[PDB]
Amino acid sequence: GSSLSPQALAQPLLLQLFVDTRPLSQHIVQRVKNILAAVEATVPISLQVINVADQPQLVEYYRLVVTPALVKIGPGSRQVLSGIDLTDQLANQLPQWLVQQEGIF
């Protein structure tokens, strides 16, 4: 009936990067991790890399077709960043993820 210690804490940010194991992606990976690490915060982000070479099925699921690519799953809205612009777009999307402001009260 009543709750004593309700559970509902925010979970870390889920971030995934799709790469074909090419150094360029590893290159971007450092930039990806380096940027995310440039904010940490109370809501840390977990970066998981998926080898599109081993599993092209989820790539199509995300309508993903270009690599390297970076996709945010949440919590929150889902986004797909790709075209070696991951760092530019990521840096642009990250603030928005934290800010989440559509305007001023």
Please, are residues 46 and 79 in contact by the beta-carbon 8 Å criterion? Answer: no
User: What 3-state DSSP class applies to 82?
Assistant: strand
Q: Is 40 left (phi over 0), alpha (psi -120 to 50) or beta?
A: left
Q: DSSP secondary-structure letter at 52? A: T
Please, are residues 95 and 79 in contact by the beta-carbon 8 Å criterion? Answer: no
Q: How many CB atoms lie within 10 A of CB 18?
A: 25
φ, ψ (nearest 5 deg) of residue 94? -55, -60
Q: Which of 46, 58, 45 is nearest to 18 (CA)?
A: 58
Helix locations, 9-101, DSSP H: 23-36, 57-61, 86-99
| CATH number of the 12-100 domain | 3.40.30.10
Task: Indicate the helix (H) or strand (E) that contains 76.
Answer: none
- For the chain, the structural domain boundaries read 12-100
The method of structure determination was NMR
Amino acid at 63: R
Q: How far is CA 85 from CA 6, 7, 18, 46, 62, in A?
A: 41, 38, 13, 20, 18
